[PDB]
């Protein structure tokens, strides 16, 4: 989980994409009832403003 | 016991390690589109025993 980034490495396009998936699962077309998630995070300001 | 094991083993030896795939879209029973793991997507049939 991160942000858009992407004026650098091939790693940077990759974090934003993976982030997209965590958003949907939390709520964006898929809702938690069948699978539940608890996220353990070191630094909460790394994540998306959406997340 | 070894006879049964080897006879079943010959049948394994003539038989190859067939392509694994996934069903991209089933149009109908007789034409299924698959994504094969070798690369090229194929049109495949089905057997009636399924």
């Amino acid at each position: 989980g991160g942000r858009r980034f992407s004026e650098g490495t091939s790693a940077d396009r990759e974090i934003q994409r993976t982030l997209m998936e965590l958003l949907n699962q939390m709520d964006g077309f898929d809702t938690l009832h069948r699978v539940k998630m608890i996220m353990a995070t070191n630094r909460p300001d790394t994540l998306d403003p959406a997340l | 016991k070894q006879y049964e094991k080897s006879e079943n083993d010959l049948k394994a030896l003539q038989s190859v390690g067939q392509i694994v795939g996934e069903v991209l879209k089933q149009l109908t029973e007789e034409k299924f589109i698959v994504k094969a793991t070798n690369g090229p997507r194929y049109v495949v049939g089905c057997r009636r025993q399924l």
Binding site: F29, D30, T31 | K25, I33
Partner: protein, 60 residues
């Protein structure tokens, strides 16, 4: 061979080299879809608010 020319899925033989048939552009799709499954916690009826916005979505 007049319904041959559009860009759509098709079949070719490996080495019996024939364009054997044509297939719909529907075929070839690995994307899933949820028409309304895992239903959001919102609806048009389950809000009354964002009225100013209710015209902008309705149209689009």
């Amino acid at each position: 061979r007049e319904l041959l020319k559009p860009n759509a899925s098709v079949a070719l033989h490996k080495h019996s080299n024939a364009l054997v048939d044509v297939l719909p552009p529907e075929a070839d799709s690995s994307i899933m879809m949820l028409t309304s499954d895992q239903k959001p916690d919102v609806m048009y009826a389950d809000i009354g608010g964002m009225d100013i916005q209710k015209q902008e979505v309705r149209e689009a």
